[PDB]
RNA sequence: GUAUGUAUUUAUUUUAGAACUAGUUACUAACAUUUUUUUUUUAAAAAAUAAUUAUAUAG
RNA sequence: GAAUCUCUUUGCCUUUUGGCUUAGAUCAAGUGUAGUAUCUGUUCUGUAACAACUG
């Protein structure tokens, strides 16, 4: 949707620094960009 | 055959469009710098005209909540309507002249602009961080004709000078589907059938095409009638059978939409010819033409 | 997506038969590798074979005569074994003679290649057709259809575009005349400095060297017609 | 990837149809980076071997 | 004898192949993703008459 060139901040680990230590959000982030690389939407329909 | 006629406009009417789902009152925007609403019921008189722009009026459209309505014209600027009170939401001056403009169906708010310079403006009514400009689109090459929104609120179509059709998702700049042919023509106007698996368009070389509005969309032939001149409105029935088109000269011409024939061809008073071409949802068999003549015809 | 055919030589079916006539009608005896590509599964010098040992209608496929059977005797007896040479001599393709004269002395497995494919008869084919003979069919008239270069092709694309064009150019003039401003026609630049416009003259005007006779009247009621047919087509539009 | 071509007007000149559905072919696209030598039986048996790659192509 | 309309052979050919050389030369076995093309299948088929006014 941008129409402009511009740096936009996302914080990847949503809230999970308060109850997940942070080294294993990182491999849970593994673990869900690997199904999206992967399969693509029996991921995507997983989440959903 | 038609019945009665309106004391539509000096020197022509432009644009004239029905509301959307019960249709009791029409408006047309004319040539002579004046906006006027009438009723299709009742009294069929003018129950309230409006003085717009300076130049002539281009076209109209409908926010499909139906308060406010859009207007477009030949000094560069935009306005919308309020159809009730009469008074002006916003207003606004553009670069180049603008061919077309629509609103959206979900949103009141959200609505698109094609000029004659090869762009889609989109703006919107909330924001006001730049002028409202969401959003402008740049893949067409030449001056745009029509565009016209999906009913679904997703994805719209624009067609252009430059003999070819694109298709957008709603605010993404890129279209996902490019109609280029070798042999075709370009198309002033855009419509979608009511049973809304076709949407068809009235091509240049006097006939009409139709394709999907599914996926994959792909081009039936509409043909019987020269409108090779100065680019008419087309409409469908409101139980989605019949289309009906006019010509350049004075005529209307009803197909039947599930086997291609030409059931009728109706003539009109006026020795102009005829563009808009609108029909009543509510009550059937009931059609509207009007063109460079200036009264607005109400044929069955 | 197919697999490499490495090795094409096969037996020549009924629908290979008919594109290669099809394609020598259009391609002309001495391109064979134009024609071999039209086909798939054969190649250039078995498009070759094909046709100049069964497909030619100069060929002599008849029965032999008794004069002409005696003088195949009489040459293979002279000739040892030098069956092109006697084929030569008897204006009749070589394998027909070779057949012949193992008649005339008398009184294959399967996964075998067979060398002698293209002198051989045809196969008729099954009742509906198999898919890729769908598609070779679909793309040989793909391409027996086509007579264009690339200029050409493109000056068709060209016009159709210019007209178009020409005729959205006079639709905003028709809608800007009912609005009542009268845009009038832009004409096309020139491209170089003495390009010709053709309006403004009669361009290289030859004057028709008078004579005897006398033309005053004639020339009075011309002028008056142009005049009016001019002034015709100012109000009323031709 | 070049060559080469095409598009970019404002300072106002007097008045037979309807619906549902998915893959097979071609062609195109400066758009994109899962080892070696065997043996043997009818999956199992043997033997073996060694601090890590280019932004470079045009008639 | 002669004119009008209409059909056969006979003339006319009237959209009726516009250079050269070493046939000018070479070769048509790549994966994904995407665009374009086409191709199979299934189901369903208000009008008339009478009484009154002519504004």
């Not at chain 2, 419509?191 to 599914?214: E, G, T, W």
Request: proline residues 5%; aromatic residues 10%; glycine residues 4%.
């Amino acid at each position: 949707k941008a129409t402009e060139p511009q740096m936009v901040l996302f914080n990847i680990y949503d809230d999970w620094l308060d109850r997940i230590s942070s080294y294993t959000a990182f491999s849970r982030l593994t673990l869900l960009l690997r199904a999206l690389k992967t399969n693509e939407e029996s991921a995507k329909m997983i989440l959903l | 055959k038609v019945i009665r006629n309106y004391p539509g406009h000096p020197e022509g009417t432009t644009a004239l469009k029905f509301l959307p789902k019960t249709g009791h009152l029409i408006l047309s925007g004319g040539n002579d710098h004046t906006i006027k609403i009438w009723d299709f019921y009742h009294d069929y008189e003018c129950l309230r005209d409006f003085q717009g722009h300076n130049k002539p009026i281009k076209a109209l459209r409908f926010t499909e909540d139906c308060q406010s309505f859009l207007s477009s014209s030949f000094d560069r600027s935009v306005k919308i309507w309020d159809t009730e009170t009469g008074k002006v939401k916003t207003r606004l001056h553009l670069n180049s002249t603008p061919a077309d403009v629509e609103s959206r169906p979900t949103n009141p708010h959200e609505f698109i602009v094609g000029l004659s310079n090869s762009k889609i403006l989109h703006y919107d009514d909330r924001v006001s961080e730049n002028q409202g400009l969401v959003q402008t689109y740049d893949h067409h090459l030449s001056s745009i004709l029509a565009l016209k929104y999906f009913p679904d609120g997703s994805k719209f179509i624009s067609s252009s000078e430059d003999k070819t059709v694109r298709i957008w998702e709603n605010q993404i700049n890129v279209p996902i589907k490019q109609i280029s042919d070798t042999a075709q023509h370009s198309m002033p106007f855009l419509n979608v059938h009511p049973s809304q698996n076709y949407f068809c368009a009235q091509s240049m070389d006097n006939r009409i095409y139709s394709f999907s509005l599914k996926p994959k969309y792909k081009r039936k032939i509409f043909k019987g009638h020269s409108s090779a001149g100065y680019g008419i409105s087309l409409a469908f029935s409101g139980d989605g059978r019949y289309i009906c088109s006019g010509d350049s000269k004075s005529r209307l011409f009803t197909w039947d939409w599930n086997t291609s024939r030409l059931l009728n061809n109706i003539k009109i008073p006026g020795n102009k010819p005829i563009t808009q071409v609108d029909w009543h949802p509510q009550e059937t068999s009931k059609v509207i033409c009007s063109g460079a003549a200036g009264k607005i015809y109400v044929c069955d | 997506p197919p697999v490499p055919i490495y090795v094409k030589g096969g037996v020549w079916t009924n629908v290979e038969d008919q594109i290669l006539k099809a394609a020598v009608q259009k391609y002309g005896t001495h391109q064979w590798s134009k024609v071999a590509s039209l086909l798939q599964k054969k190649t250039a010098r078995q498009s070759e074979l094909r046709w100049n040992e069964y497909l030619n209608p100069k060929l002599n496929f008849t029965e032999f005569s008794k004069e002409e059977d005696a003088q195949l005797l009489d040459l293979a007896r002279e000739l040892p074994n030098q069956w092109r040479t006697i084929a030569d001599m008897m204006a009749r393709p070589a394998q027909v003679c070779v057949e012949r004269y193992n008649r005339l002395l008398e009184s294959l497995k399967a996964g075998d290649i067979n060398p002698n494919a293209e002198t051989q008869m045809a196969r008729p084919d099954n009742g509906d057709l198999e898919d890729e003979e769908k598609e070779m069919l679909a793309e040989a008239r793909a391409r027996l259809l086509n007579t264009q270069g690339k200029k050409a092709t493109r000056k068709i694309r060209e016009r159709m575009l210019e007209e178009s064009k020409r005729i959205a150019e006079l639709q905003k003039r028709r809608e800007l005349k009912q609005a009542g401003i009268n845009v009038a026609i832009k004409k096309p630049k020139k491209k170089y400095g003495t390009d010709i416009d053709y309006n403004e003259d009669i361009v290289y005007e030859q004057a028709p060297m008078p004579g005897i006779y006398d033309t005053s009247t004639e020339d009075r009621q011309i002028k008056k017609k142009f005049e009016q047919f001019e002034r015709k087509v100012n109000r009323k539009g031709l």
